[PDB]
Amino acid sequence: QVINTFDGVADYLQTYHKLPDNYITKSEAQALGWVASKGNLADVAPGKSIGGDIFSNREGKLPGKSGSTWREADINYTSGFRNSDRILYSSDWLIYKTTDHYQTFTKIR
């Protein structure tokens, strides 16, 4: 009953104001033994996806409200290398999607 889809995570974030319990940060996954080049996240952190890290947004692709911050989380991840799907959420709970590895974004909430 894993919450990792665009609609499940977006609805969760907007209701609970945090990610569901299957998410761990990049640092936390690295410390567990995640080696990006080996595509081994599912072996070292079973059931987990990477998420919760601050997203810089220095290229101004996402709208920037002064004082507000963005964070990202992986979507649709089950095993292997990470994919190119990410949910982006602000401290005001605006929610955006990318499926092209942060090239472009579209609003979903």
Ligand SMILES: [Zn+2]
């Ligand atoms: Zn770019």
